[PDB]
Design a protein around this ligand. Structure first.
Ligand SMILES: Nc1ncnc2c1ncn2[C@@H]1O[C@H](COP(=O)(O)OP(=O)(O)O)[C@@H](O)[C@H]1O
Ligand SMILES: Nc1ncnc2c1ncn2[C@@H]1O[C@H](COP(=O)(O)OP(=O)(O)O)[C@@H](O)[C@H]1O
Ligand SMILES: Nc1ncnc2c1ncn2[C@@H]1O[C@H](COP(=O)(O)OP(=O)(O)O)[C@@H](O)[C@H]1O
Ligand SMILES: Nc1ncnc2c1ncn2[C@@H]1O[C@H](COP(=O)(O)OP(=O)(O)O)[C@@H](O)[C@H]1O
Ligand SMILES: Nc1ncnc2c1ncn2[C@@H]1O[C@H](COP(=O)(O)OP(=O)(O)O)[C@@H](O)[C@H]1O
Ligand SMILES: Nc1ncnc2c1ncn2[C@@H]1O[C@H](COP(=O)(O)OP(=O)(O)O)[C@@H](O)[C@H]1O
Lengths: 333, 204, 292, 347, 126, 281
């Protein structure tokens, strides 16, 4: 009968904890028996504490709650009401695999160890001796692999997957900006382990707020310690633009890159998208390999999408490769 | 008026007739039970006070016939717009740099109104009491409504309406709801009785 | 407009209270001033004569001064290159003043609110009027020293109001003749002549580098507590090392003693000083067996 | 779990700001009417002064408890706590410019008998120059690893918050809680985030940053018995930091973490060869003379990278041609974009 | 300060001109609609510093009859919102009560414009 | 609660705490702070920035002579909403994002309005950031199906291409039937990052109106009011030459006012002629 002393709470204790309880943000904790609380008004209140409360969320001062008539620290602030509601802590994963990336294979192999292998087989390293490396940069030309594809596939066989972008990093109003990456590497740090994406950092459009912001992804990356803070994966189109302070092969570890396609991935990456389609009689490479004298990774995505759509305006799931030509002149000409 | 709205019960003797959604109505001390609706107590009608003629305005002819066209003519000839089809334009925005025809044309409009030309300078919409102002400017709008036909003239809006606000410390947490419900108040008068909101500002 | 109290339920004014303000102005109440006398300052003695003549001589001889019939001089602005003897002349002059004194900083006067920066300089001069006769030291005017300009989108007007209310309880209307001012700025080109109206801030006294003799004097000053050998020569310690602004010379002594105990001896020598220098700057640069 | 009987004798208490004493004194609740009140029964008249804050009850509005000052946003800075695990035996490749740093940071220790003995006051400031490859901070983690003191890390953009004058509020507040702890110190990481030496009065853009920095160098030396805050500051950038900051008094004994030479650089991979289960005979000094002007805090990318080659080639050991395969990979192929001659010009 | 035009030196044109424009409508107002125009209201004493500005109005302060409202324009503004507008409507309504009156607002760059776009709290309040 | 915004309270027996969902204001903690019942939902968040930015004006099919344009936008705005079945069997991945480039006027804020509401989808506009990114996505997700619209300012550095991509980054990997719409005056003025086929699955083109399309739009805006026994509107369209959508609503209202000036209740022929002969400025 271990559940006998639980019901004394709702007749001797919940009479104290269970009223129009108020919520005011906690302040500098004077030692055990008390605390000070600035309430919702702004009036400080030297409150007491509770004996039975299992106090673990004392940090001067997350929104603690109080009693109405008497003043105390009655409960705590589960239902945290998470700042950065929409940062994509992925629960429903997207639709990319090891197979549909299918092109650059060296690269997805290298990022596959550099993010995934301290998770899918972490018992290489301490048996071998080395530390696991930190996050990569993976720069490239535009459309050369969807830079944000070999990180997306690094999503869907791991734990949590936190991202950022150059746009969430910079700020208008701010004057006070480098806060975003304070609590981005504080929320990022908290999951243990989560991967933070500095999606396309390229910082263009005074200047000194951008300077201090870059200095705080810099320092807030590697100041004094780190939790499981692999995933700092940076996609970039302009590697020669950003200040070479990020890479002290400490702040940014080992990093992997690629030529745009070759023709082998013009074929092999062309036949992934149109594998979903229904064209079969004259699937070609003469209109694909030397057609544009190198066509992006996307231009084939847009040639499949604009191809099937342009043969879908006239309502047929048929195989016409002359409509494909109207798709070519339609999308890039 | 003491800060918040909060729930009530209204007595049976008052009829459910005059309770418009901005009707100033009385409550009971220590109870807050509704008791009686009130006349629109709030701003001045400006009885015959400003005096420059529309004949010594000088030069201004096309602006004078546009403001003559879209303000006092749809208050007098309110139905000819309902005999052709084009609506009377609701507001009048006057942007003048650096200021030539602002406030003698809005001063010589005030003679031959035969209409409640209520003035308010757009700078006491902010008050030291928190959450005061929106109630103030909706008192201004209904004070033009029960005095129709009226011409609301609010100056230098960029005092109360700008492009750039501040989510933190509340110097402008209330002026983003001075503008907001005024912006909701003007949409509440598309039934077109007679209230015309002309407004001026040095720079737009 | 005074500060008069009242009952909390009956609301009738019982007694008066003398006028008040925050403790952020009442924090400027230094009592521990004299430990840096006029002997520790060295090599600047015409600036000591000029400043001390300009400040504490109207504190003890005004009437004789009034018998000449000329106005008491206003605030003194001290200025110099990076770090000479500004604040040491501040607490050296405030050391042996026998008055009251307030150590008002530059950036204490600029805060996030509109009211606070302005309210506290006027109440600072109100404190100085109430407790007068007192002199006021404003350290580092570069806080309120960025000046008026044709200001489009961003600008700044908060520091403008703090400064422009500072210089009008300074040389606005008449009642000035109670409280003297001392200023100290490491930069002067940042300042508009509003803060230089010949009267707002009298004698703009120059702080140079300490000259050829003065650094030997300062190396004798600071090294007064250390056990120095009789076989020492401060003059060659001066004439060898001539770019320093007097602050480094203080150091030269102190980490000269530090490496003197890094050797482990309880008594320092000349090459401790001489070898102590090759430490103030250093910046490496080896592989020089070729500088002949 | 049974504090019901004691809650009624607690008296929930409102903090108010005390001021002048006529006796009587004036409190200020910051939401109420700043009114006049005396002491209760037991608190000393010399225990309560101006400026500080005391707690007031709500029943008859009177003071019982004197209370500590407020530090609201800089609570997290503080002296970190615990501290990382690297130490003096880890950060290798310098051997003397530790000892310059060591004798300044380690005088609440043994050392004060030497300094009150032969009349020295120790230097307060330490400055740490280097290109962004050396253990500019790693030494900061070592002096945080053993300190016998506080450790207030405060990095260079917890100060740049965008109300004017407010960044100067956090700095003076930082030195307010710094003086309320004997034998304390502080660390300003990345101080070139407050630089831009002292600009014009035209399009003034740095000005707010300026005054934060300005009150910083008012606290580093002005009108105080100063306590003993052994400040030590580490940035990768010379004179963007103006004078009156580098000048001895607030940052003497600057340390130049230059790129290590042929002798020392062996030693730093000797730090990172404390792992990896390497081959029987391996030529370390070869691996010094193949990289030879890299940077101290990289050779760990040679370490980690060659271990990545060894795990890739399913070997339990590490040969020479994966070391030599690695120095081909992170010296030759990773010098195209990665630049430390750009900061070596800056020094 | 019983300062008079004797202490004002070498600007007799400016002080005779300011004196006539400021108190001469208050001496003989009938000569102006005689000519056929209302008298002017304001003068802006722009110049390099020193030069006798603040003082000039000291000499105007100790030689006139009406309540010379002499205010520094930066003791106007307060930390509460909508407070400075209360103070300035209180000032000008106080000028409506006692007439004729002179209102001296020196140094006015605190309230001085060239209105901005972006500081949004410390500037749009003014 | 309204004045000071927090507390945790109870709920009476006859309230059934199970349906009372967040952001649905109703309370009664009269004194002890305990609930009673429910009240008028009181318009959730977007209801706000729709009625507030009341900019979007209900439009349906009155588009003045655009049929290729509405064929192409209805080809990519209600087929990916109301018939996804032929897209998941045709091999197409997803069409999303349409760029409306044309002259100022003539198709903007009205084509993307009209085909948003034939479909009854929603029409969220993030044009401007005055009073409140990433939070808007939650609202759009809640609406389930949505349409996000943009702004076009160059003349009548990184203005709204930043947020544009900012929501194409979240939109690319993404609870699926949300379709961003960007209107710009020129295709060349915008970013090279948007120049990434296909980032903008659809680049619809708006020409300035020719003769007959301007007799169609001037036919509709002339169908706003009274005219007379006969107009034969062609002579007004006769000088249409570079016109604009607006340049038509303007002259029809000015023709109405030029009939109003003589206290006359029928808009004659010549009030058009002095309308369009007036506005050549
Ligand atoms: N296997 C592949 N090969 C080449 N490109 C691909 C492949 N899979 C996806 N992509 C394209 O990559 C794009 C997204 O990532 P990326 O090309 O890096 O864009 P960005 O470089 O602008 O971040 C998508 O438009 C997608 O069509
Ligand atoms: N078109 C005009 N004809 C005659 N007088 C004018 C005209 N424009 C301005 N004024 C005169 O010049 C002064 C400035 O007016 P203005 O700056 O336009 O007022 P506001 O700024 O309130 O619009 C007024 O007092 C007015 O008498
Ligand atoms: N002439 C001098 N006499 C004595 N000390 C000096 C002199 N010049 C510099 N110093 C030293 O410099 C320090 C004070 O520097 P200071 O001149 O106040 O810098 P700042 O002028 O920027 O405040 C003191 O430690 C002091 O010993
Ligand atoms: N002598 C050394 N011994 C060991 N590691 C070193 C040494 N010098 C540099 N490092 C490496 O450099 C890194 C320290 O980075 P840090 O110098 O703080 O960069 P930054 O100067 O940009 O902050 C650590 O990973 C450390 O191992
Ligand atoms: N013509 C003058 N005659 C005498 N004193 C003058 C003259 N012009 C300026 N001043 C000086 O200016 C001071 C008054 O301040 P002022 O010059 O008005 O500066 P501000 O314009 O900033 O108030 C007086 O104390 C006086 O010495
Ligand atoms: N083809 C058209 N049909 C109907 N109205 C049109 C047409 N072209 C332009 N307009 C007019 O333009 C206005 C809508 O503005 P809009 O076209 O969105 O601005 P923009 O031209 O900048 O996109 C409406 O008032 C409408 O009458």
């Amino acid at each position: 009968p271990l559940e006998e002393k639980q019901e004394e709470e709702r007749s001797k204790v919940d009479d104290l904890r269970g009223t129009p309880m108020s919520v005011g943000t906690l302040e500098e904790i004077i030692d055990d028996n008390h605390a000070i609380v600035s309430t919702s008004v702004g009036s400080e209140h030297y409150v007491s504490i509770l004996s039975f409360v299992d106090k673990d969320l004392l940090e001067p001062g997350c929104s603690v709650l109080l009693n109405h008539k008497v003043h105390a620290v009655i409960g705590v602030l589960m239902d945290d009401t998470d700042p950065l509601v929409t940062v994509m802590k992925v629960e429903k994963a997207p639709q990319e695999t090891y197979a549909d990336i299918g092109g650059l294979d060296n690269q997805i192999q290298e990022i596959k160890e550099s993010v995934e292998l301290p998770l899918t087989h972490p018992e290489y390293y301490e048996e071998m001796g080395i530390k696991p490396p930190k996050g990569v940069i993976l720069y490239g030309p535009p459309g050369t692999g969807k830079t944000l594809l070999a990180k997306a596939v690094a999503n869907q066989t791991s734990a949590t997957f936190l991202r950022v972008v150059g746009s969430e990093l910079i700020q208008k109003y701010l004057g006070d900006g480098p806060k975003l990456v304070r609590e981005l590497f504080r929320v990022a740090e908290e999951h243990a382990p989560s991967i933070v994406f500095i999606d396309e950092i390229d910082a263009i459009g005074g200047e000194r707020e951008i300077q201090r912001t870059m200095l705080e992804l810099l320092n807030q990356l590697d100041g004094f310690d780190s939790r499981g803070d692999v995933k700092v994966i940076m996609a970039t189109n302009r590697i020669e633009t950003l200040d070479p302070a990020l890479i002290r092969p400490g702040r940014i570890d080992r990093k992997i890159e690629f030529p745009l396609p070759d023709e082998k991935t013009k074929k092999r990456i062309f036949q992934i998208h149109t594998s979903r389609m229904t064209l079969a009689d004259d699937v070609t490479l003469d209109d694909l390999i030397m057609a544009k004298d190198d066509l992006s990774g996307a231009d084939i995505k847009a040639i499949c999408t604009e191809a099937g759509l342009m043969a879908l305006r006239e309502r047929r799931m048929k195989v016409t490769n002359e409509d494909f030509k109207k798709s070519k002149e339609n999308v890039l000409y | 008026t003491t800060g918040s709205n909060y729930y009530v019960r209204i007595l049976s003797t008052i009829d459910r007739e005059l309770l418009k959604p901005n009707a100033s109505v009385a409550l009971h001390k220590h109870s807050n039970a509704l008791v009686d609706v009130l006349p629109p107590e709030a701003m001045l009608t400006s009885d015959q006070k400003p005096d420059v003629m529309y004949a010594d305005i000088g030069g201004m002819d096309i602006q004078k016939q546009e403001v003559r066209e879209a303000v006092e003519l749809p208050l007098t000839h309110f139905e000819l717009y309902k005999q052709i089809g084009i609506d009377p334009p609701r507001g009048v925005l006057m942007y003048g740099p650096p200021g030539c025809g602002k406030t003698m044309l809005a001063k010589a409009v005030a003679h031959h109104t035969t209409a409640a030309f209520i003035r308010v300078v757009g700078s006491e919409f902010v008050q030291k009491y928190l959450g005061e102002g929106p109630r103030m400017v909706r008192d201004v709008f209904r004070l033009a409504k029960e005095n129709a036909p009226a011409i609301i003239f609010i100056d230098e809006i960029d005092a109360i309406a700008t492009k750039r606000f501040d989510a933190q410390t509340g110097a402008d947490r209330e002026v983003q709801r001075i503008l907001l419900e005024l912006l909701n108040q003007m949409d509440g008068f598309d039934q077109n009785v007679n209230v015309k909101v002309i407004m001026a500002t040095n720079r737009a | 407009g005074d500060l008069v109290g009242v009952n909390k339920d009956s609301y009738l004014i019982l007694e008066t209270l003398p006028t008040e303000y925050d403790s952020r102005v009442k924090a400027m109440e230094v009592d521990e001033r004299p430990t840096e006398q006029y002997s520790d300052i060295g090599g600047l003695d015409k600036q000591i004569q000029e400043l001390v003549e300009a400040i504490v001589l109207p504190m003890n001889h005004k009437e004789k001064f009034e018998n000449l019939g000329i106005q008491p001089p206003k605030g003194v602005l001290m200025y110099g290159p990076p770090g000479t003897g500004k604040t040491l002349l501040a607490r050296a002059c405030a050391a042996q003043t026998k008055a009251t004194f307030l150590k008002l900083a530059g950036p204490q006067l600029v805060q996030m609110f509109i009211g606070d920066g302005a309210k506290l300089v006027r109440d600072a001069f109100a404190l100085a009027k109430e407790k007068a006769p007192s002199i006021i030291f404003i350290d580092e005017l570069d806080a309120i020293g960025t000046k008026r300009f044709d200001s489009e989108k961003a600008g700044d007007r908060e520091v403008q109001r703090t400064m422009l209310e500072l210089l009008n309880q300074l040389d606005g209307f008449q009642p000035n003749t109670q409280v003297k001012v001392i200023a100290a700025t490491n930069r002067v080109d940042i300042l508009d002549p509003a803060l230089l109206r010949s009267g707002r801030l009298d004698r703009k006294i120059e702080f140079p580098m300490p000259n050829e003799e003065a650094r030997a004097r300062i190396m004798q000053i600071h090294s007064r507590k250390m056990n120095v050998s009789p076989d020492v020569n401060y003059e060659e310690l001066a004439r060898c090392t001539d770019d320093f602004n007097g602050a480094q010379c203080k150091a030269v002594c102190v980490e000269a003693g530090m490496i003197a105990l890094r050797r482990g001896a309880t008594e320092l020598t000349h090459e401790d000083y001489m070898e102590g220098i090759l430490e103030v700057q250093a910046k490496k640069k080896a592989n020089l067996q070729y500088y002949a | 779990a049974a504090d019901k009987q004691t809650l009624q004798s607690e008296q929930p208490l409102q903090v108010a700001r005390c001021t002048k004493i006529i006796p009587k004194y004036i409190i200020n609740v910051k939401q109420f009417a700043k009114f006049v009140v005396d002491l209760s029964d037991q608190v000393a008249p010399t225990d309560i002064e101006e400026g500080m804050r005391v707690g007031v009850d709500r029943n008859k509005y009177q003071i019982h408890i004197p209370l500590p000052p407020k530090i609201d946003p800089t609570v997290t800075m503080m002296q970190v706590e615990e501290k990382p695990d690297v130490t003096y035996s880890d950060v290798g490749g310098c051997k003397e410019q530790i000892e310059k740093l060591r004798e300044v940071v380690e005088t609440p220790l043994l050392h004060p008998e030497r300094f009150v003995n032969l009349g020295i006051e120790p230097p307060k400031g330490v400055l740490l120059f280097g290109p962004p490859g050396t253990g500019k901070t790693l030494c900061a983690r070592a002096v945080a690893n053993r300190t016998d003191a506080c450790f207030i890390r405060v990095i260079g953009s917890e100060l740049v918050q965008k109300y004017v004058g407010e960044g100067a509020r956090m700095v003076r507040e930082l030195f307010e809680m710094a003086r309320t702890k004997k034998a304390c110190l502080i660390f300003f990481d990345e101080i070139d985030a407050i630089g831009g030496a002292r600009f014009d009065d035209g399009a003034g853009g740095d000005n707010e940053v300026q005054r934060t920095m300005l009150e910083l160098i008012n606290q580093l030396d002005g009108f105080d018995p100063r306590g003993n805050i052994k400040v030590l500051m580490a940035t990768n950038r010379p004179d963007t930091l103006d004078p009156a900051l580098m000048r001895p008094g607030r940052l003497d004994r600057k340390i130049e973490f230059s790129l290590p030479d042929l002798e020392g650089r062996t030693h730093i991979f000797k730090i990172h060869a404390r792992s990896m289960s390497v081959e029987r005979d391996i030529r370390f000094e070869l691996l010094a003379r193949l990289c030879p002007n890299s940077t101290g805090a990289e050779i760990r990318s040679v370490c980690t990278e060659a271990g990545m080659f060894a795990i890739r080639a399913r070997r339990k050991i590490a040969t020479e041609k994966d070391f030599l395969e690695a120095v081909n990979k992170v010296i030759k192929s990773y010098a195209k974009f990665s630049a430390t001659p750009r900061y070596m010009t800056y020094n | 300060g019983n300062v008079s035009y004797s202490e004002i030196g070498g600007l007799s044109e400016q002080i005779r001109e300011l004196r006539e424009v400021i108190e001469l409508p208050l001496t003989n107002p009938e000569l102006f609609q005689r000519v056929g125009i209302i008298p002017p209201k304001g003068c802006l004493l722009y110049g390099p510093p020193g030069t006798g500005k603040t003082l000039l109005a000291r000499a105007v302060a100790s030689q006139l009859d009406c309540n010379f409202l002499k205010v520094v324009s930066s003791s106007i503004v307060d930390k509460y919102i909508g407070e400075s507008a209360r103070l300035i409507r209180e000032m000008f309504n106080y000028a409506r009560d006692h007439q004729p009156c002179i209102i001296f607002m020196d140094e006015i760059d605190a309230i001085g414009g060239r209105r901005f776009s972006e500081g949004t709290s410390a500037d749009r309040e003014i | 609660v309204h004045p000071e915004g927090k507390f945790v309270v109870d709920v009476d027996k006859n309230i059934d705490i199970n349906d009372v969902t967040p952001n649905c204001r109703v309370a009664l903690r009269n004194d002890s702070y305990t609930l009673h019942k429910i009240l008028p939902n009181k318009v959730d968040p977007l209801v706000s920035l729709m009625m507030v930015e009341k900019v979007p004006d209900s439009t349906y099919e009155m588009i003045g002579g655009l049929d290729k344009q509405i064929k192409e936008i209805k080809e990519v705005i209600e087929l990916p909403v109301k018939h996804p079945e032929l897209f998941e069997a045709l091999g197409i991945a997803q069409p999303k994002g349409v760029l409306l480039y044309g002259p100022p006027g003539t198709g903007k804020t009205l084509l993307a309005r009209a085909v948003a509401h034939h479909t009854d989808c929603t029409f969220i506009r993030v044009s401007g950031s005055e009073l409140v990114v990433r939070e808007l996505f939650v609202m759009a997700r809640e609406h389930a199906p949505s349409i996000i619209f943009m702004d076009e300012i160059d003349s009548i550095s990184g203005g709204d291409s930043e947020v544009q991509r900012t929501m194409l980054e979240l939109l690319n990997q993404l609870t699926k039937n949300i379709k961003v719409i960007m209107a710009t005056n020129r295709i060349d003025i915008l970013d090279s990052a948007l120049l990434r086929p296909g980032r903008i699955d659809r680049k619809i083109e708006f020409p300035p109106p020719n003769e007959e399309a301007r007799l169609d739009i001037l036919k509709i805006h002339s169908r706003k009011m009274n005219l007379t026994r006969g107009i034969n509107l062609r002579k007004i369209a006769e000088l249409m030459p570079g016109a604009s959508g607006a340049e038509v609503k303007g002259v029809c209202t000015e023709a109405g006012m030029y009939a109003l000036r003589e206290r006359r209740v029928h808009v004659t022929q010549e009030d058009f002629e002095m309308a369009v002969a007036k506005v050549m400025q």
